[PDB]
Structure 1
Amino acid sequence: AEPEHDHRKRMGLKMLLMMGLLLPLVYAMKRHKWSVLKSRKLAYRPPK
């Protein structure tokens, strides 16, 4: 019923390993660019 059984699990292992690498690296690229905004500071100086 499922001749692809073994091959799909071998691929599944490779998919998990690549995701364990790519997810934190892509997460790191997101945080890298966004850090400009996440640490920005604002000040309001109206005339008096």
Structure 2
Amino acid sequence: AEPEMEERKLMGFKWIFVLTLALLQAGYYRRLRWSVLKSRKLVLDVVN
């Protein structure tokens, strides 16, 4: 029924591992571009 199961489980270990490295790069790249906004100071004049 499934003559492809060994070519399939070996290709899926190679690309789930490689894609969890690109997820660690993209969460650093996101928090680096957003740090000037996330730490800025703002004074406004309004009280209530």
Instruction: Give the shorter-chain TM-score range.
Output: 0.7 to 0.9
Q: Which runs of no fewer than 5 residues in structure 1 stay unpaired?
A: none
Instruction: Give the structure 2 partner of residue 3 of structure 1.
Output: 3
Moved more, 16-25 or 37-46: 37-46
Residue 30 (structure 1) aligns with:
30
1:14-25 to structure 2, matched below 5 A, reads 14-25=14-25
1-side partners of 2:44 and 2:26: how far apart? 35
TM-score normalized by structure 1? 0.74
**Cα RMSD for the two superposed structures:** 1.5
Where does structure 2 lack aligned partners over 5 or more consecutive residues? none
- AA aligned to 1:25 is Q
Give the Å deviation of 1:26.
0.9
User: Which portions of structure 1, spanning 4 or more consecutive aligned residues, are displaced by more than 2 angstroms?
Assistant: none
Counting matched residue pairs gives 46
- Aligned equivalents of 1:3 and 1:25: distance in 2? 36
